Each structure stands twice: as C-alpha cells, then as structure tokens.
Motif scaffolding. Structure first.
Motif, PDB file in Angstrom:
ATOM      1  N   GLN A  70      -6.574  -4.016   0.494  1.00 19.05           N
ATOM      2  CA  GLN A  70      -7.419  -5.057  -0.136  1.00 19.05           C
ATOM      3  C   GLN A  70      -8.279  -4.415  -1.231  1.00 19.05           C
ATOM      4  O   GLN A  70      -9.039  -5.129  -1.874  1.00 19.05           O
ATOM      5  N   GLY A  71      -8.128  -3.114  -1.430  1.00 18.83           N
ATOM      6  CA  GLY A  71      -8.790  -2.376  -2.524  1.00 18.83           C
ATOM      7  C   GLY A  71      -8.192  -2.698  -3.898  1.00 18.83           C
ATOM      8  O   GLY A  71      -7.325  -3.572  -4.049  1.00 18.83           O
ATOM      9  N   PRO A  72      -8.637  -1.971  -4.945  1.00 19.75           N
ATOM     10  CA  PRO A  72      -8.133  -2.179  -6.309  1.00 19.75           C
ATOM     11  C   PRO A  72      -6.598  -2.225  -6.356  1.00 19.75           C
ATOM     12  O   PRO A  72      -5.975  -1.302  -5.880  1.00 19.75           O
ATOM     13  N   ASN A  73      -6.052  -3.246  -7.004  1.00 23.25           N
ATOM     14  CA  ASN A  73      -4.611  -3.560  -6.985  1.00 23.25           C
ATOM     15  C   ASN A  73      -4.144  -3.783  -8.419  1.00 23.25           C
ATOM     16  O   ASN A  73      -4.486  -4.827  -8.998  1.00 23.25           O
ATOM     17  N   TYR A  74      -3.335  -2.870  -8.961  1.00 21.95           N
ATOM     18  CA  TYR A  74      -2.970  -2.923 -10.388  1.00 21.95           C
ATOM     19  C   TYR A  74      -1.738  -2.067 -10.666  1.00 21.95           C
ATOM     20  O   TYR A  74      -1.212  -1.362  -9.782  1.00 21.95           O
TER      21      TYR A  74
END
Ligand SMILES: O=C(C1CC1)N1CCN(c2ccc(F)cc2)CC1
Lengths: 412, 412
Positions: A153-157
């Motif tokens: 659910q952390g930074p997603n890119y």
C-alpha cells in the motif's frame, strides 16, 4: 535526515536462467544466452536471434487464469518481483503494508499484446480486442498486480526511460526509502520486445547486430567487429530496505546502495556524444552522492551495448571520471552474454553488481577478441576475474540521452 | 530539512484550447470539449466521441521534418513544455543547465504510431516499419527531445502510472527540487489515445460512456445517469522551481506546491475500493507532507472520471478525510468538460488547481443534473463558484490502484 538503504532480496529472469543463482552461474562461466528466436517466423527480418527466456513457467507464480490476461513483460516482472520478496524473508502485515511500495518499469512494455490486438482490430474489427488489453499491457501493471497480490500500500509507480529504466527504478526507489516515504521498495524492470514490431522497428533503425550465422558471437562490446546490440528479454527485481528496518528483523543484507546519479546528455535522440560527457556527469553525481573518492571504485558493470558509438563513449567517460585509476578498476559488459534487456538491463545488471560484491569476482566481457582503438582498460576479456571489490558501479545510458549510475558497496 | 517549490510557468493542450488561458476560459464558462471524433471510421465502435485537440499546429514548435519523427502524444507534451518554459521566463545557461531537468510522462503513449506501423508490418512486412518507430514512440522522448532542444542536463526521466501519471510526474519533480537534486523541473504528461486502439481497448472493457447521441452530456461525474468516462487528448506542463531561485531572477510565482502524497489501494486492477480507503490514505499523506490540517483545504479538483464506482469512492474518501469540513470545501471534476486525458489528466488538473488559486473561483462540475446516493457535497454543479481558496488539492486514482494527491497553496 537521509537513511541508509540495503539489498535484502533479488529476483531474475534472463536468457541464462529462470532465477538469480542459475543466471549468475552462466555469467561466471562466460556462457551466452543468445540463440535464433523460435517463437515466430523471422525469415523476412535482418536479425533472427536474441536472448529469449527459455522454459518460463508462469504457473510457478500465477494461476493460468490471471496469467492469460497479462503481457509476457508483466509476467516476467511479477516472476522476478515474487522471487525478490521470497528471497528477502519479508512478511507483509497490517503494521508494515503502508511502508512497502513497488517501482517496476519497462522501456517498451506490452508490444506483443498491442501487436496481436492491433491485428485483431484491422482483420476482424474492435469487437475482437481483448477486454484485458489495457490493464493487461500498460507498463504500471507490474507495480499494480504485485501490490494487489502481496497487499503493498506504499508508493506505487513505474518508470519508462528506455534502456535506463531498471537503473532509474532502483535509484529512485532508494530515494523513496532514504527520504522516509517508504521503508521497503520492490524495484527493477522487465522487458519482452521480441515481436514483429520490436525486431522490425530496431531493424529499420539498423541498431541491431545482423550476425545471424554466429548469434553467440554477436554481442561483442568494445570489439573492433561489433555491429549493434542484441535484443534480449527478462526481468530483475531487488527488495530495497532501510538499514535499521533490515537489522531489526535479522534480514540477510547482500550489500548497501550508497550512490545514485542521473544526468541528461542533451545531445541526440539515439546516439551518445563521442566523449561520453553526460555519462561522466552522471557517474560524478553518483560518486559524490556516495561520498566516495573515485579511486574506491573496483568494478564497473558497463552499459556496454555493442554499438560502435555507445561502447567508445563509455571508455571516454570512465577515463574522464577516474583518470589514472581507470587502469586499476575492472569494467565488464555482461551484455556480451545476456544481450540488451533494454528497460530490464539496469535491473539484472544491478543484481550482477551486487553478486560481484558477494563473490569478489568481476564477470567477463565475452567475445572481446580484438579490442577497438582506445579500449585499453581492464575489460575482463573472455574469463571471470576473481579480485577485491568493495565498491561496484552499474551504468545505463538510453535514448533521449538519459543516464543513470548506481553505486553499491560491501555491507559489514 | 527541505526546500520550497513554486510554479513559475504553465503550458497545455486540451479539448478546450491550444494553451492555458483558452482552456481556462472554457472551464470557467462550463464549455464541453467533447464531440464525435472526425477523420476516422468509428461505425463498428460502441463509443464514437471524445476530447480531441482542435487545430493543433506542431510547426509553431518544430520543423515539419522533426515533427514527422514523433507520435502525437510527444508533439503534445513538447507543445505544453515549450509553452511552460516560455511562460516561466527562465533563461538556460552553462551556469544552470545541470540544475534543470524534465519529467514528462504518459499512461498509454504512442497508439497512433503503433497503429500506422502495425499496418505497414501486416501489409508490407517488417522492412516498411519507420526507422523512427522506436525513438519516435517511447514515452521518455518528451523528456528526451525537450532536454536536447533546450540544453537541459538535469534529472531526465518519465513516469507511466496510467491515469495518475501527470500527478506523480509533478509530485516527484517537486521532490527532485525539495531535496536539492535540481533547481528547476518541467513536469506533467501528455496523451493521444482517442484513436482506434484506445476507443477499441477501453470499449472492449465497457469502461467508456456510450452516450453517442449527446457527447457533451456523456461526462457527468457523480450524476445518477453516468455510464463511464470519456477518452480525451492533450498535455500539461508546469515549470517547478526552488523558491529562492525564483525570487532571485524576479519570476512571477503562480502558487506554491506544499504537498505530495502517494498510495496503493492494493485492491483491484481497474476498480477502486467502495469506501476509497486508498484515496483517503493518499490525501492524508499529502496533507501531512504539507504540514496542513484537513480544515485548511478549500478546493479539490477531483479525479471524478464519471465511472459509477470511482466517483462514489472519492465522495467516501473526502468525507473520511475531512469529517466536519467535507461540506465547507468545494470539490469539482473538470473532466465533466475536458473528458479524461488519462496520464495528462493530473497535469491539466494541477494547472486548473493553480488557476483556481490565482482567480479565487471553483470550476464547475457540468452535467450534474441529479446527484447520486450520498453525492451531497458542494460539487459546484453547473456553474463556476467564486470563493476564498487558500489551499487546493488535485487527486488522481488510476488502474493498479495507484493514487496521487498534490497540495497547492497561495504564495505572497
Ligand atoms: O504498449 C503500450 C500500452 C498501450 C498498450 N504503451 C507503452 C509502450 N509503448 C511503446 C511502443 C513502441 C516502442 F518502441 C516503445 C514503447 C506503446 C504504448
């Protein structure tokens, strides 16, 4: 202030292996992964070989149900990601799922899927386009699908910087952790551009080796008889972790990620400048970022594509950054064996750089029979060289003049 | 610690205009840029309309010859970028070129080029593929070509996070500057997917409004009769700049970028969670990043795509984050007018958020005739609403559950 980042898991598909240890075994034995392509008819193409992943079983990772919806480059990215997370020993929980993100990239993305669906559209109409065409092909869906399956659910890119993607993905994921935005990132890249469009498009640019009758000898970085890159498929993923987070859970630490450099050549759409000025700017940024004396660098995993202009620009850059120390370090191109995995190149090569530190060996540049004019450094010709390696550098330099450099060192 | 980041220049192509002030005038007049797509046989397609860029002249930016090498999504990104740099009044020199970078992204990239080169490959075989197919199609070539054209040697990269791309591009460029890796970045995104493969690909998923009889009423965020999003084309670019750098050269400062949040839903490939938990975490992450209480938010440029589930998730996320203030703030979807520009949505919508601050007006949500169950917020139905706006949020929530939020504040 800025936190330390360590590598605690790695995962790979390459033309040499279905994981890291089997790929690494190939690298150290000077084994080529290049072969005529079997998955389609290339008789009308000027290049008919590349580095394929051999015997990939997606059913070791995904239900045939989920897998049917996903382009090969996403399947490769997920396989490498799953390997990396398992290898890390990390357990995902309510307490940490917000602190774990993903940055898996591609230079070209789902070229097979878009070709097949473009063919459907043209011969049969829009009602034959797969419902899964968009979510199943777009580059960010490695990060997407990994996050859904693992509960990240952390930074997603996702980055897409052509041949620099894997290096930028790892570097910027480290900055995420360094700056407090996450404690763990799964970072790297994946590529599968061996369809009519990929082989055709690079062919039309005359960027590819045409050595069809000796494919294993095609990729020959710094050799006077090189004639362009070899197109290769696969994936690399690393679990990056904040140091104290790793220590607190008794993680095995492979190495520390100490430096990241980026620069733009601002020179040409496809060709690097002859003097490697942008590559030099980028390495100097990475070395300053790592607080290093350039003489501390022991091993460079070069970009080393086997293009005339590319290979010589890297020599000029290394000589310019390191001066006399350029003659003491070892520099090799594992692309001599794997070919050019494009967006995944920086990801698998970051892993080779970390294993170079683990095992204290510089991998060979195979096929370096006759080094070209001015290519007079230790290029580890033919055979792996056991040696002291405390600091290893991994270079990528892609279209648009986009440069990345990662610096790793041994962790005590 | 951290450095402050201001907006000193903006550029845009949208379905409302060929620059910012023309696009902005349409927004404030509640004009639709949606229409049947011309110069294309869409008989066999369930959706036949979208937001096209109208009367774009690439020869104001590039030679006909340099334009021929580049997909429309790259022409659009270069147009917005050149506009933004010209609007900033920035002068590039040897003394500053290493401090000026680019992060212009795309979610879907070069569908048009892929279509044309597929046709050549299927009809005439691989030798008729254009030599510029790869460099003229890869997503990082807006970053690439802009850096080559203007001499920019700073961080050079491109994001691809589907519908979140422009939001993430601007946020991560802001961080580059905050943390001293650059003094200036050009950031945003561009898209041209309102073509056969885009209408066909999204069409096969039934993700598009099929309101062919009344295209201007198709995009109706939070309206009970909405039936999916409208595919639109264009680009947005912003010049981000370190505050002291901007002050020293007497830059005009539009507003300050005070916050950036990211999150992953880790829920579904295309659908957000019902309660928008991910969108909630992201907005909370952005407000914490800016050091702001939820009560200080005055205006939200919503993702508001006109998908049944997407629109209702954002209402739930906003109620969750803002509690007793959810009704005092104003929230609108400018997609009611522009349609969904995908990776360029976050770029044009950040510019609209900056202009909301400059002009102290919330843009309307047009076509909001009958708010749906629970859509009882101030959604600025029908007409622009002049009001006090100190703090403005811009949300993007894309495929793979990838979330981004930008926080802008008035500067004085
Ligand atoms: O494939 C997709 C998704 C829509 C399906 N996009 C990203 C990769 N793009 C690309 C094409 C040629 C090329 F040489 C490099 C990149 C095309 C657009």
């Amino acid at each position: 202030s800025r936190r330390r980042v360590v590598i605690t898991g790695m995962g790979m598909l390459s033309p040499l292996g279905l994981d890291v240890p089997s790929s690494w075994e190939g690298i150290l034995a000077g084994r080529s992964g290049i072969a005529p392509i079997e998955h389609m008819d290339l008789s009308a193409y000027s290049t008919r070989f590349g580095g394929s992943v051999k015997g990939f079983n997606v059913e070791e990772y995904l239900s045939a149900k989920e897998a049917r919806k996903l382009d090969l480059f996403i399947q490769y990215g997920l396989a490498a990601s799953f390997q990396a997370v398992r290898d890390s020993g990390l357990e995902v929980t309510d307490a940490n799922r917000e602190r774990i993100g993903v940055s898996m990239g591609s230079g070209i993305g789902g070229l097979t899927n878009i070709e097949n669906n473009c063919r459907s559209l043209f011969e049969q109409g829009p009602r034959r386009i797969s419902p899964f065409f968009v979510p199943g092909s777009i580059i960010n869906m490695v990060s997407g699908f990994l996050s859904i399956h693992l509960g990240l659910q952390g930074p997603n890119y996702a980055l897409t910087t052509a041949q620099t993607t894997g290096t930028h993905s790892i570097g910027m994921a480290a900055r995420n952790i360094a700056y407090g935005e996450a404690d763990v990132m799964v970072a790297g890249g994946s590529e599968m551009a061996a369809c009519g469009l990929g082989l055709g498009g690079f062919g039309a640019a005359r960027a590819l080796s045409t050595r069809n009758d000796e494919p294993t000898r095609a990729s020959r970085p710094w050799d006077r008889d090189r004639d362009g890159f070899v197109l290769s498929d696969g994936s690399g993923a690393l679990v990056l972790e904040e140091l104290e987070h790793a220590r607190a859970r008794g993680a095995r630490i492979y190495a520390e990620l100490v430096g990241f450099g980026m620069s733009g050549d601002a020179f040409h759409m496809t060709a690097p400048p002859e003097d490697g000025a942008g590559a030099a700017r980028c390495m100097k940024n990475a070395l300053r970022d790592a607080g290093l004396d350039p003489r501390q660098v022991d091993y460079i995993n070069a970009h080393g594509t086997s293009t005339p202009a590319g290979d010589i620009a890297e020599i000029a850059a290394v000589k310019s950054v390191f001066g006399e120390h350029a003659h003491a370090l070892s520099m090799s191109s594992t692309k001599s064996m794997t070919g050019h995995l494009l967006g995944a190149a920086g990801a698998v090569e970051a892993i080779f750089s970390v294993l170079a530190l683990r095992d204290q060996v510089a991998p060979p540049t195979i096929n370096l029979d006759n080094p070209d004019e001015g290519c007079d450094l230790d290029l580890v010709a033919h055979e792996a060289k056991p040696r002291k390696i405390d600091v290893a550098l991994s270079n990528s330099f892609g279209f648009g003049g986009t440069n990345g450099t990662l610096v790793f060192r041994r962790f005590a």
